[PDB]
UniProtKB/Swiss-Prot annotation, chain A:
Listed name of the protein: Pre-mRNA-splicing factor ATP-dependent RNA helicase DHX16
Entry keyword annotation includes Nucleus: yes
Any one GO biological process: mRNA splicing, via spliceosome
Keywords, comma-separated and alphabetical: ATP-binding, Cytoplasm, Disease variant, Helicase, Hydrolase, Immunity, Innate immunity, mRNA processing, mRNA splicing, Neuropathy, Nucleotide-binding, Nucleus, Phosphoprotein, Spliceosome
GO molecular function, one term: ATP binding
Superkingdom: Eukaryota
Assembly information from the UniProt record: Component of pre-catalytic spliceosome complexes. Component of the minor spliceosome, which splices U12-type introns. Interacts with GPKOW. Interacts with TRIM6. Interacts with RIGI.
Illness the protein is tied to: Neuromuscular oculoauditory syndrome: An autosomal dominant neuromuscular disorder characterized by variable features including myopathy, neuropathy, hypotonia, joint contractures, growth delay, chorioretinal lacunae, sensorineuronal deafness, agenesis of the corpus callosum, and seizures.
Function: Required for pre-mRNA splicing as a component of the spliceosome. Contributes to pre-mRNA splicing after spliceosome formation and prior to the first transesterification reaction. As a component of the minor spliceosome, involved in the splicing of U12-type introns in pre-mRNAs. Also plays a role in innate antiviral response by acting as a pattern recognition receptor sensing splicing signals in viral RNA.
Curated annotation (Swiss-Prot), chain D:
Residues of the full protein shown: 10 to 108 of 802
Protein known as: Cell division cycle 5-like protein
Function: DNA-binding protein involved in cell cycle control. May act as a transcription activator. Plays a role in pre-mRNA splicing as core component of precatalytic, catalytic and postcatalytic spliceosomal complexes. Component of the PRP19-CDC5L complex that forms an integral part of the spliceosome and is required for activating pre-mRNA splicing. The PRP19-CDC5L complex may also play a role in the response to DNA damage (DDR). As a component of the minor spliceosome, involved in the splicing of U12-type introns in pre-mRNAs.
Record-annotated HTH myb-type domain positions: 1-47, 48-99
Result for mutant: W44G: Abolishes DNA-binding
Source organism of the structure: Homo sapiens (Human)
Subunit structure: Homodimer. Interacts with DAPK3. Component of the precatalytic, catalytic and postcatalytic spliceosome complexes. Part of a spliceosomal 'core' complex consisting of CDC5L, PLRG1, SPF27, CCAP1, CCAP3 and CCAP6. Interacts with PLRG1, Lodestar/TTF2, and NIPP1/PPP1R8. Component of the minor spliceosome, which splices U12-type introns. Within this complex, interacts with SCNM1. Component of the PRP19-CDC5L splicing complex composed of a core complex comprising a homotetramer of PRPF19, CDC5L, PLRG1 and BCAS2, and at least three less stably associated proteins CTNNBL1, CWC15 and HSPA8.
Designated gene of the protein: CDC5L
Swiss-Prot record, chain E:
Segments for region (Interaction with PHF5A, SF3B1 and SF3B5): 34-57
Subunit annotation: Component of the 17S U2 SnRNP complex, a ribonucleoprotein complex that contains small nuclear RNA (snRNA) U2 and a number of specific proteins. Part of the SF3B subcomplex of the 17S U2 SnRNP complex. SF3B associates with the splicing subcomplex SF3A and a 12S RNA unit to form the U2 small nuclear ribonucleoproteins complex (U2 snRNP). Within the SF3B subcomplex, interacts directly with SF3B1 (via HEAT domain), SF3B5 and PHF5A. Identified in the spliceosome A complex; remains associated with the spliceosome throughout the splicing process. Component of the spliceosome B complex.
UniProt subcellular location: Nucleus
Name of the gene this protein is made from: SF3B3
Positions of post-translational Phosphoserine modification: S45
Protein name in UniProt: Splicing factor 3B subunit 3
Protein family membership: Belongs to the RSE1 family.
Region (Interaction with SF3B1 and SF3B5), start-end ranges: 82-111
UniProt comment concerning the protein's domains: The core of the protein consists of three beta-propeller domains.
Swiss-Prot record, chain F:
Function according to Swiss-Prot or TrEMBL: Component of the 17S U2 SnRNP complex of the spliceosome, a large ribonucleoprotein complex that removes introns from transcribed pre-mRNAs. The 17S U2 SnRNP complex (1) directly participates in early spliceosome assembly and (2) mediates recognition of the intron branch site during pre-mRNA splicing by promoting the selection of the pre-mRNA branch-site adenosine, the nucleophile for the first step of splicing.
Source domain of life: Eukaryota
Family per record: Belongs to the SF3A2 family.
Subunit: Component of the 17S U2 SnRNP complex, a ribonucleoprotein complex that contains small nuclear RNA (snRNA) U2 and a number of specific proteins. Part of the SF3A subcomplex of the 17S U2 SnRNP complex which is composed of three subunits; SF3A3/SAP61, SF3A2/SAP62 and SF3A1/SAP114. SF3A associates with the splicing factor SF3B and a 12S RNA unit to form the mature 17S U2 small nuclear ribonucleoprotein complex (17S U2 snRNP). Identified in the spliceosome 'E' complex, a precursor of the spliceosome 'A' complex. Identified in the spliceosome 'A' and 'B' complexes.
Transmembrane feature ranges: none
Zinc finger map (Matrin-type): 37-67
Gene that this polypeptide is encoded by: SF3A2
Full protein segment contained here: 18 to 93 of 464
Subcellular location: Nucleus
Protein's name according to its UniProt entry: Splicing factor 3A subunit 2
Length: 224, 816, 77, 99, 111, 76, 128, 81
RNA sequence: AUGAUGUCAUACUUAUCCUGUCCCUUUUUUUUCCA
């Protein structure tokens, strides 16, 4: 479905070029999508974030409110992924400052290892034939490359809750989502867990139209 | 190529997967006739991977098993060469924690082996009984159970004889033994036609060297006993002895399952066997009463429950034999600390009580009411409560009852959780002491009262509760000083301001007044109720619930130790309980409006209800309009109908709708005595069915519904005809509530007026140009048809016959 | 419209109902079958016909149940 | 804030009762208090407050004062006859048109 | 006296183990009968045999010996004869002397 | 209590309305047997005063009104 | 379409007016519209218990002794917007005369509508 | 939403919130006949529950006399699942 | 002379709610002319 396999199960140039990456094929499809969408740098840094996320923001009990605040600062319209994008952007902007993350309630470990994974990604980028491009502030390309990677990882609104696009099994939004109260109609995620209730992490609001742009063979219109 | 084409046209499984139910009909029928030609050769390889595809859904599975079963019925022969494949790919489903995977694999394998070529099964699944893997042996064994479901044991039983008499492998003897136990699980009663054939099958392995086969065969004995209820050892005696000896000459897992089977046969047994067998096994039991092991404890205690619970275990036997070590080693803190042991120790100890009485068991668990792990004394009262509640307290002697009452008092004070445990324990224990409790009422109350004095709310509330429990026996032992006490002292505490205590106080006062009637209450209700009226303003759900309960009792029965003016003030206070957030309160309020209308006359309360109808915010209107209905029901409706009707003239909306809704409820409540006021009410409903608003016509329609169902059979059909004329035009409507009340009016009106009249109203618009009107008339005619489809046979029109059909019914116009 | 899943389940539930497109043929044939099932059920119209023609109750109900198959002509088209 | 309906109920109340009985007017209004009533009338609904365009001499005087007495808008406003919020917005507006 | 609600035909099993109730189209049920402990009869919930587009000219219990009881109905199928605009399928349709069978172990009725 | 305060706020508002339509002498007014308001001109039904006043601040009230005057001076 | 007009309140049945409820209710209405909030709550706390009375057998005789069949419409005559507006006329059986007809034609009203041949029966006798 | 898989001989029950109303008609009065449910909405954790609340089966769901006059009580387990 | 369009607040309906809700374990992936 992602396009690494032919209809008989062998390797496309897509499949190999993604396979050289020591990172999941969904991510790999998104990185290839940066090629089409000319959002190279931004999709790169996003990948760098999802590599390690699980520990980004320190959330201490003894400084909950100032913490929620140095977090709520960056909260961008569009979703957690471009949130991470701006966060990294601002950190390196500060000159890879540790006190920066110390002031802004971010785990320096996560940030700097993510930077390293992006830099070696760039060191892979010549082989995977990617042109170093910026989206020029056009987050539409960004969300669309996110789709071209993570179309599978989607849910839609149901009046009985947020529910999958395919299996129509019932999910919920993580409390700490930058969209957690926004609650969008057409949803993309990155995790699929079921903690105390079914959950999904690193979620974003999408267009169902990009879905017929990208995967009319996997996502047909009548199902949206 | 024709084969790839046949699959191409065969994928109208899309016609069946997607589509209309028309699509389903076209494809289902065509394939159910094309099944032989299209064959399961190509089908099965298309078919298995979808039935195994991870997210084929409930009804996809349902439809595809529809397909497999009917195409296998069709192609009894034309499914032949794919048997082992279907078999092994579906096999894990019968042994599977999805009951419906078990069911659906079961059903399709039934039909598969059913229309199948027979020998095939045997041929494929002989060499797998000898196999090396217990995994595959269990899978094929429970398969064989399903295949016996599909065909029948008889055709197979000698091959079972083989797979169980094998001298090559113990693997295969174990396999046959579990095949045995598996059918014994599945078909259940269906075994008695054999009933010993399988016993023969199994006699070989309870003596066997492999503990696996030995002990699964013990469990086979268990399962066969289970499906083979009290009909005893006319079959099972053929193996009773290896069980008997291994029980002692064994240790461990065999002890477990072999004890399980023997205790499953201990019901089916008889005296000269169920005396020797039990009496023998009891000494095993006494050595196992100290067994640390959990499933040990389960099996041995279940055993004991049935075993020392027969008629051939003497009272004396148990009391001198089982009880001392049983009580010693299970009445340690460990068992109540345990999550399983609490309840199951209960089970068997209550049963031993059922066996041998209370004057020893009660005595053996008295002082466990004063142990440490509050869970423990909690358990002991759980038991005692169950016990005396089922049995009665006849034989409980003096000193026993003393230590019991005292451990009771302790448990209840010591209480440290908000639980009904100790409450119910107390209630039951005195409920059974009956009249035995006379001399400790100073003790019991003095305790409760000192608690009622405490600093923290919770214990105060508890003591109020406990009073509300023992309230009845408090009197029934003639507690002049003491029940008088509780009366006046609670009249004291009526001044609390912790809602949680005030509510319980009201509860306890109510539960005293229930036993002791009004005219000997210790505070005369002549001073009680005046004290209660300023509490009705306490804006809290629990105290409000209990207060309105108490005032409702009083206004029902007392009602004359109070003055009209008091009742009027209390009316004015009830008028704003109709906004509580809890519905029990509001229903209680309406009931007491009824009682007050009975005590005082109806007219003043009705005047105070109309003025409330003038309020906004509909919750109050709905309740008051209910209350008006209730007043009218008790004090006959002619007293209130003129005032309601006349109030239908005040030009405001909420009130005209209040009048209409109240008549709705009224005709519901009175019922068959509407044959009087139907005439009075019609010109008001026709008035409000000629428009005034949506809600106006919605409500007049509800009124028509209930009038019709009340006046069924009393001849007031001209009036309901007249109102049909006015209701039927609303048939084209859109608002859900409006059209819905209309449809309801037409079902009521259908029983009350008959189905001719309504089929005639529904005639002309069945075949109308439009589609909105066609659809409403077919909705109605559907509901007219479902109910009373059989009258209509004499109500259908005369519909002439054209050229190539016959349409007249000559049956009906034979002359005679 | 899940109401409709239930409602054409109702059409599947009660043989003889209708919908806004139903044809004179389905309508009148369903009423004709129902007429037959009740002539059989009610023990007395059976005597009426048995006596009207000179047949006997076995004869009567056999005719009726034969007729139950194509009572009102052949189908529509 | 304030909505056409309430503004007109205010207008009616005031024009009846008079312009110093703020507590009863407040009582007519659901969820409005006399502080807000008085403020609303004296800034936006009073008809001696003019919503027109600035004479050139008004404006030149405006800038003259805002240089004489910088940031004292309540003191400046009455010397030219608009409310201080009007004066303030128009002064920033002239500053920015010449920005 | 409806058409698809059971009651017109009713048969038993010769030994007295189950009853079947049946309509003249689409519906038949079966009831199981067991003496209680005190031998005062009980009757559990009913089974099902809903099969569309099918008459019944009779239903009767077949005499088996302590097997699953089972019943012989006639049948017919007006279905096609109402799909054929020619009246051919009116003729050329055949009664189908059929047996349904209990399965008291698995508690259902199998064709 | 707030419910009675609300009921009488309502009633006072209604008298305010009757006063203004008195001081503005309206022949295009009705209070119907359900306690709403009408425009006998535009056949508009209103719950409350504020809405009635906004109605009579003619936009479609104005159109139908000027049409009424035009056809009146037409026929007479 | 009924939206536009003004409409007069519902008109009770005679046998219910007769029992004189309406005047009781009018009086109570005017009382409680005049009374002021403070006095309202004062009467809430000290009720005017049994201000009024109206006797039974007046009611029970209305509802059980003078209750009478209203005018009903037989099968078929659905009410539509303006159905009620149609008024009983089309009295084609000659003899059909009205009292205003008699007055504004010169003939008599009442028991003399028989013994009064109308001015058209004059030329009926004259030329047919 | 309805179960409606056909009736049986197993009585239904009411939580105490839901105590008193009919199952569909939503009445509070004159109940005549007892409710019966299907085996499938009878089994297991659904034994003795509130057809409406889902709460514990304590009081008996009943049928308003109107519902029995119109025989809306002859359809089977009406459980809102 | 009644259109849909509406980010209109108010009024209103269901004896419709006030009891159907909440925070991740562990950890790894080769790299390329410098200028
Ligand atoms: Zn109901
Ligand atoms: Zn069910
Ligand atoms: Zn409930």
């Amino acid at each position: 479905a992602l396009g690494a396999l032919n209809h008989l199960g062998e390797l496309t140039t897509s499949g190999r070029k993604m396979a050289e990456l020591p990172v999941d094929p969904m991510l790999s499809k998104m990185i290839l999508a940066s090629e089409k969408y000319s959002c190279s740098e931004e999709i790169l840094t996003v990948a760098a974030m999802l590599s390690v996320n699980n520990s980004i923001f320190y959330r201490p009990k003894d400084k909950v409110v100032h913490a929620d605040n140095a977090r709520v600062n960056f909260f961008l319209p569009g979703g957690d992924h471009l949130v991470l994008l701006n966060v990294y952007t601002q950190w390196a902007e500060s000159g890879y400052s540790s006190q920066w993350c110390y002031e802004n309630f971010v785990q320096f470990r996560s940030m700097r290892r993510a930077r390293d994974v992006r830099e070696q990604l760039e060191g892979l980028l010549e082989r995977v034939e990617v042109g170093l491009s910026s989206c020029q502030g056009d987050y539409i390309r960004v969300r669309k490359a996110i789709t071209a990677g993570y179309f599978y990882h989607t849910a839609r609104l149901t009046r009985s809750g947020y529910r999958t696009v395919k299996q129509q099994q019932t999910v919920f939004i993580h409390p700490n989502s930058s969209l957690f109260e926004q609650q969008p109609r057409w949803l993309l995620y990155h995790e699929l867990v079921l903690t105390t209730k079914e959950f999904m992490r690193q979620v974003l609001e999408i267009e169902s139209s990009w879905l017929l742009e990208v995967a009319p063979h996997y996502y047909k219109a009548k199902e949206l | 190529p024709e084969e790839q084409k046949e699959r191409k046209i065969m994928k109208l499984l899309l016609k069946i997967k997607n589509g209309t139910p028309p699509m389903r009909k076209a494809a289902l029928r065509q394939i159910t006739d094309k099944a032989r030609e299209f064959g399961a050769g190509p089908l099965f390889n298309q078919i298995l991977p979808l039935l195994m595809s991870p997210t084929l859904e409930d009804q996809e599975r349902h439809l595809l098993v529809k397909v497999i079963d009917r195409i296998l019925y069709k192609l009894d022969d034309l499914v032949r060469p794919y048997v082992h494949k279907i078999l092994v790919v579906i096999e894990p489903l019968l042994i599977d924690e999805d009951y419906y995977a078990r069911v659906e694999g079961r059903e399709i394998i039934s039909n598969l082996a059913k229309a199948a070529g027979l020998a095939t099964m045997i041929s494929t699944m002989r060499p797998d009984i000898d196999n090396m893997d217990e995994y595959v042996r269990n899978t094929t064994a429970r398969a064989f159970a399903v295949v016996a479901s599909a065909l029948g044991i008889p055709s197979l039983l000698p091959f079972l004889k083989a797979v169980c008499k094998s001298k090559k492998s113990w693997q295969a003897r174990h396999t046959g033994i579990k095949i045995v136990q598996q059918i014994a699980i599945l078909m259940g009663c269906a075994i008695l036609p054999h009933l010993r054939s399988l016993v023969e099958i199994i006699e070989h392995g309870l003596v066997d060297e492999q503990q696996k086969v030995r002990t699964i065969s013990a469990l086979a004995i268990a399962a066969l006993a289970e499906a083979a209820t009290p009909y005893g050892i006319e079959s099972f005696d053929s193996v009773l002895k290896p069980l008997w000896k291994g029980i002692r000459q064994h240790r461990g897992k065999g002890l477990a399952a072999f004890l399980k089977a023997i205790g499953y046969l201990i019901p089916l047994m008889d005296a000269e066997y169920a005396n020797y067998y039990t009496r023998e096994v009891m000494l095993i039991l006494i050595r196992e009463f100290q067994s640390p092991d959990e499933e040990m404890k389960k099996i041995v205690l279940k055993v004991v429950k049935q075993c020392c619970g027969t008629d051939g275990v003497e009272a004396n036997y148990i009391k001198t034999e089982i009880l001392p070590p049983f009580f010693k080693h299970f009445w340690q803190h460990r068992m109540a600390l345990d999550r399983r042991n609490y309840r199951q120790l209960v089970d068997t100890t209550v049963e031993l009580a059922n066996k041998v009485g209370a004057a020893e068991i009660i005595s053996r668990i008295v002082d466990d009411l004063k142990d440490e792990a509050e869970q423990y004394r909690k358990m002991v009262m759980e038991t005692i409560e169950k016990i005396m509640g089922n049995l009665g307290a006849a034989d409980i002697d003096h000193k026993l009852e003393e230590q019991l009452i005292d451990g009771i008092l302790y448990a209840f004070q010591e209480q440290t959780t908000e639980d009904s445990v100790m409450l119910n324990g107390f209630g039951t224990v005195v409920n059974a002491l009956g009249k035995r409790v006379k001399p400790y009422l100073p003790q019991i109350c003095g305790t409760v009262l000192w608690r009622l004095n405490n600093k923290s709310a919770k214990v105060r509330q508890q003591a109020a509760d406990l009073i509300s429990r023992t309230a009845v026996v408090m009197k029934t032992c003639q507690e002049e000083k003491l029940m008088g006490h509780l009366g006046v002292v609670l009249y004291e505490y009526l001044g609390e301001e912790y809602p949680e205590v005030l509510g319980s106080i009201l509860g306890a006062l109510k539960a005293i007044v229930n036993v002791i009637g009004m005219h000997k209450m210790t505070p005369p209700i002549k001073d009680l109720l005046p004290r209660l009226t300023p509490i009705l303003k306490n804006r809290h759900e629990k105290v409000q619930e209990n207060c309105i309960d108490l005032v409702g009792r009083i206004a029902d029965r007392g009602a004359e130790y109070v003055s009209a003016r008091e009742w009027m003030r209390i009316c004015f206070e009830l008028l704003e309980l109709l906004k509580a957030h809890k519905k029990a309160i509001r229903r209680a309020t309406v009931n007491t409006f009824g009682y007050i209308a009975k005590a005082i006359g109806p007219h003043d309360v009705l005047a105070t209800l109309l003025n409330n109808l003038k309020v906004q915010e509909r919750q109050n209107r709905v309740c008051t309009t209910v209350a008006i209905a209730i007043v009218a029901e008790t004090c006959s409706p002619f007293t209130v109908l003129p005032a309601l009707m006349n109030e239908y003239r005040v030009p405001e909306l909420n009130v005209q709708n209040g009048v209409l809704k109240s008549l709705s409820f009224l005709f519901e409540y009175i019922g068959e005595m509407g044959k009087d006021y139907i005439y009075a009410v019609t010109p008001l409903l026709e008035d409000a069915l000629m428009d005034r608003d949506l809600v106006h016509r919605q409500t007049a329609s509800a009124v028509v519904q209930h009038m019709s169902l009340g006046v069924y059979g009393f001849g007031c059909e001209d009036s309901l005809n007249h109102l049909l004329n006015y209701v039927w035009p609303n048939v084209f409507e859109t608002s859900p509530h409006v059209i819905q009340a209309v449809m309801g009016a037409l079902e009521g009106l259908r029983v009350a007026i008959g189905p001719c009249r309504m089929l005639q109203y529904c005639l002309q618009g069945l075949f109308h140009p439009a589609r909105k009107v066609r659809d409403v008339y077919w909705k109605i005619y559907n509901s007219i048809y479902i109910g009373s489809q059989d009258a209509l046979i004499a109500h259908y029109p005369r519909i002439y016959n054209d050229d190539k059909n016959t349409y007249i019914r000559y049956e009906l116009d034979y002359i005679l | 419209y899940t109401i409709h899943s239930q409602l054409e389940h109702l059409q599947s539930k009660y043989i003889g109902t209708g919908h806004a497109d139903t044809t004179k043929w389905e309508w009148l044939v369903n009423q004709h079958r129902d007429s037959y099932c009740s002539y059989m059920g009610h023990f007395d119209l059976l005597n009426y016909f048995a006596i009207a023609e000179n047949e006997s109750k076995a004869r009567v109900r056999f005719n009726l149940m034969e007729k139950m198959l194509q009572p009102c002509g052949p189908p529509a088209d | 804030v304030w909505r056409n309906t309430e503004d007109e109920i205010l207008k009616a109340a005031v024009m009846k009762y008079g312009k110093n009985q703020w507590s009863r007017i407040a009582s007519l209004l659901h969820r409005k208090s006399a502080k807000q009533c008085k403020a609303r009338w004296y800034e936006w609904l009073d008809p001696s407050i003019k919503k027109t365009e600035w004479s050139r001499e008004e404006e030149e005087k405006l800038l003259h004062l805002a240089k004489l007495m910088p940031t004292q808008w309540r003191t400046i406003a009455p010397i030219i006859g608009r409310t201080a919020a009007q004066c303030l917005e128009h002064y920033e507006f002239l500053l920015d048109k010449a920005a | 006296c409806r058409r698809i609600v059971p009651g017109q035909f009713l048969a038993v099993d010769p030994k007295g183990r189950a009853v079947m109730i049946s309509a003249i189209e689409k519906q038949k049920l079966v009831y199981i009968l067991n003496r209680d402990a005190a031998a005062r009869l009980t009757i559990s919930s009913p089974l099902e045999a809903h099969k569309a587009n099918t008459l019944v000219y009779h239903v009767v219990g077949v005499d088996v010996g302590f097997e699953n009881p089972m019943f012989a109905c006639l049948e017919m199928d007006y279905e096609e004869a109402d799909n054929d605009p020619t009246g051919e399928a009116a003729a050329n349709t055949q009664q189908t002397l059929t047996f349904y069978e209990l399965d008291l172990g698995l508690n259902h009725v199998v064709r | 209590s707030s419910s009675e305060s609300n009921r009488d706020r309502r009633e006072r508002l209604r008298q305010l309305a009757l006063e203004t339509i008195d001081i503005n002498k309206d022949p295009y007014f009705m209070k119907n047997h359900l306690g709403s308001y009408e425009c006998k001109l535009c056949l508009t039904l209103h719950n409350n005063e504020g809405s009635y006043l906004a109605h009579t601040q003619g936009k479609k009230h104005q159109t139908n009104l000027a049409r009424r005057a035009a056809k009146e001076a037409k026929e007479a | 379409g009924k939206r536009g007009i003004e409409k007069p309140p519902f008109e009770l049945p005679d046998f219910i007016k007769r029992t004189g409820i309406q005047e009781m209710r009018e009086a109570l209405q005017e009382k409680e519209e005049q009374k002021t909030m403070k006095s309202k709550m004062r009467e809430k706390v000290r009720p005017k218990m049994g201000k009024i009375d109206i006797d039974y057998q007046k009611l029970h005789d209305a509802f059980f002794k003078w209750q009478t069949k209203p005018k009903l419409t037989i099968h078929g005559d659905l009410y539509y917007e303006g159905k009620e507006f149609e008024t009983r006329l089309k009295e084609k059986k000659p003899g059909d005369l009205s009292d205003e007809l008699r007055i504004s034609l010169g003939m008599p009203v009442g028991p003399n509508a028989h013994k009064v041949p109308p001015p058209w029966l004059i030329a009926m006798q004259r030329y047919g | 939403i309805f179960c409606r898989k056909q009736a049986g001989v197993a009585i239904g029950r009411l939580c105490e919130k839901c105590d008193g109303k009919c199952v569909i008609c939503d009445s509070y009065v004159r109940p005549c006949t007892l409710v019966r449910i299907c085996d499938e909405c009878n089994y297991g954790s659904y034994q003795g529950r509130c057809v409406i609340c889902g709460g514990p089966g304590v009081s008996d769901a009943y049928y308003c006399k109107e519902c029995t006059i119109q025989e809306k009580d002859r359809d089977g387990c009406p459980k809102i699942v």
